[PDB]
């Protein structure tokens, strides 16, 4: 199972699409909830994501059907369309997904932050980095729910520098636009959700702690973090989970005044990537980095929870470390880092020693040698 949150808040989940176009915002919101008696959230909600995951994997098109038979009914422990818990302003996290992922594959992170009192807006990127995503051609196509699908772009070796950079910049824009949509709803903008979902967005009016905004993402998402903080100062700190540094322009490195936290797997990282992380460091800037012992790249996404230990380990969904213990360190270190650089009046500073990598399942900085 994808773990329930460790915080005291009940967790709710809904989807938001505004506007309906390939240029709109698409997000999955995880939020502190009033009620705990709702239907659980369907983890992968459309057959077309399974198709896209199969194209991402480069497997035979029949793997789409297999993946759908195995996982098409799986849920995650968030209350679908639960009323938002009133009477409190919540800090905001914008979450960016990896290459070949989509908005629903980081519920372990999104549920755990929500259980501690954040709203999480996990964006669905329309930059063709997602396995699949969808939008509506126009108001008519939106009305009748005639979904148009967009599938992952396969790149040639020549296309990589140029297209990965064009996409990380779209990702940054999608993070800022998602932020503006949430901030406008918090004001009280009369947003009509493109999806016919029974969660009134008017709930979120005056519910965002507007000074306490952060950007978190895994992999391509980790590079999205860095690009976003460089172009949008409304974000006050970033956390890059096993960031894939390749998409970033050489210009961005010296252009991040915000606090930034690198949380790395043991077995994903390599000299080229670590050097790019080190190009982010200056004595004037706050930087922190840890490595989770025994961990793999997939430890940060929900497929680490989707199978048994033996199959998991075999497919590199799991590492030498227990997945629950792994996500636990990443989420608790994130929480203490957020409290510190957002100025939260919570108890997350109980995990400050994780920021420093002070655990037996933690390495301070990196294992990777860069000389
Ligand atoms: N590449 S990634 O972001 O690690 C990823 C994780 C889970 C599913 C698909 C992709
Ligand atoms: Cl790995
Ligand atoms: Mg900007």
> Which ligand has the shortest distance to the CA of 54?
1
Query: What's the maximum distance between 2 C-alpha atoms anywhere in the chain?
Result: 59
CA distance 50 to 124: 15
Query: What is the CA angle 128-101-3, rounded to 5?
Result: 160
| Structure token digits, residue 60 | 């035979």
Structure-solving method = X-ray
Q: Would you say the C-alpha torsion 326, 331, 336, 341 has a positive or negative sign?
A: positive
| Structure token digits, residue 355 | 């920021």
From ligand 3's centre to the CA of 197, what distance in Å? 30
Task: Tell me, rounded to whole angstroms, the distance of Cα 345 from its chain centroid.
Answer: 24
CA distance 36 to 11: 8
Q: Is the CB of 303 under 6 A from ligand 1?
A: yes
Q: Which atom of ligand 1 is nearest to the CA of 97?
A: 3
From ligand 1's centre to the CA of 49, what distance in Å? 12
What's the CATH class of domain 1-371? alpha beta
| Structure token digits, residue 359 | 């655990």
DSSP code of residue 241: E
> Rounded to 10 degrees, what is the CA torsion of 2, 294, 259, 210?
10
Q: Which atom of ligand 1 is nearest to the CA of 302?
A: 7
Q: Quick check: helix, strand or coil at residue 351?
A: helix
**Resolution of the coordinates, Å:** 2.0
Q: Which residues surround ligand 2, an ion (CB under 5 A)?
A: 267-268, 296-297
Minimal CA–CA distance to 112: which of 3, 207, 199, 197?
3
Residues after which the chain is discontinuous, using a C–N cutoff of 2.5 Å: none
Q: Give 7's contacts (C-beta < 8 A, 6+ positions apart).
A: 112, 114, 115, 116, 117
Q: Would you say the C-alpha torsion 292, 252, 369, 296 has a positive or negative sign?
A: positive
Q: Is the CB of 100 under 6 A from ligand 1?
A: yes
- 87 class by beta-carbon count within 10 Å (0-12 exposed, 13-18 middle, 19+ buried): exposed
Q: Which residue's CA is minimally distant from atom 9 of ligand 1? A: 101
Q: Quick check: helix, strand or coil at residue 33?
A: strand
From ligand 2's centre to the CA of 341, what distance in Å? 29
Angstrom CA distances, 15 to 36, 195, 250, 251, stand at 18, 8, 35, 35
Backbone angles phi, psi at 5, to 5 degrees: -70, 155
Structural contact between residues 168 and 250, judged by C-beta atoms closer than 8 angstroms: no
Q: Give 66's contacts (C-beta < 8 A, 6+ positions apart).
A: none
Structural contact between residues 3 and 305, judged by C-beta atoms closer than 8 angstroms: yes
Q: Is the CB of 355 under 6 A from ligand 1?
A: no
CA distance 352 to 371: 30
CA distance 61 to 223: 30
From ligand 2's centre to the CA of 34, what distance in Å? 38
**Residues identified as active-site:** 219, 242, 297
Dihedral class, residue 242 (left if φ above 0, else alpha if ψ from -120 to 50, else beta): left
- On the CB side of 289, CA atoms within 13 Å amount to 20
| Structure token digits, residue 144 | 């009748």
């Amino acid at each position: 199972k994808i773990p329930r949150g460790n915080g005291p808040y009940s967790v709710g989940c809904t989807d938001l699409m505004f506007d309906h176009t390939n240029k709109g915002t698409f997000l999955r919101l995880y939020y502190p909830s009033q009620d705990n008696d709702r239907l659980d959230t369907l983890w992968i909600p459309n057959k077309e994501y399974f198709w896209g995951l199969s194209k991402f994997l480069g497997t035979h098109w029949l793997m789409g059907n297999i993946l759908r038979l195995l996982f098409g009914s799986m849920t995650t422990p968030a209350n679908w369309n639960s009323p938002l818990r009133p009477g409190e302003k919540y800090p905001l996290v914008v979450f960016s997904h990896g290459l070949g992922a989509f908005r629903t594959l980081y519920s372990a992170i999104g549920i755990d932050l929500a259980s501690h009192g954040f709203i999480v807006a996990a964006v669905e990127h329309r930059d063709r980095s997602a396995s699949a995503t969808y939008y509506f051609k126009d108001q008519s196509a939106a009305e009748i729910g005639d979904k148009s699908w967009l599938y992952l772009r396969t790149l040639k070796q020549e296309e990589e520098t140029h297209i990965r950079n064009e996409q990380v910049r779209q990702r940054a824009k999608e993070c800022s636009q998602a932020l503006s949509l949430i901030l406008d709803i918090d004001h009280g903008k009369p947003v009509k959700n493109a999806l016919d979902l029974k969660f009134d967005m008017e709930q979120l009016k005056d519910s965002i702690d507007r000074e306490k905004i952060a950007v978190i993402g895994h992999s391509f998402g980790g590079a999205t973090v860095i690009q976003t903080l460089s172009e949008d100062q409304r974000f006050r700190c970033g956390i890059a989970l096993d960031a894939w540094m390749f998409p970033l322009g050489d210009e961005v490195y010296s252009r991040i005044p915000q606090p930034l936290f690198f949380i790395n797997s043991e077995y994903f990282q390599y000299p080229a990537n670590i050097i790019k992380m080190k190009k982010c460091y200056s004595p004037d800037k706050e930087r922190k980095m840890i490595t989770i012992r025994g961990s793999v790249h997939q430890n940060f996404a929900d497929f680490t929870f989707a199978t048994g230990k033996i199959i998991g380990h075999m497919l590199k969904l799991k590492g030498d470390i227990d997945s629950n213990v792994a996500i636990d360190l990443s989420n608790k270190a994130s929480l203490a880092f957020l409290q510190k650089h957002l100025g939260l009046h919570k108890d997350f500073d109980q995990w400050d020693c994780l920021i420093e990598g002070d655990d037996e399942n933690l390495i301070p900085g990196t294992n990777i040698n860069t000389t």
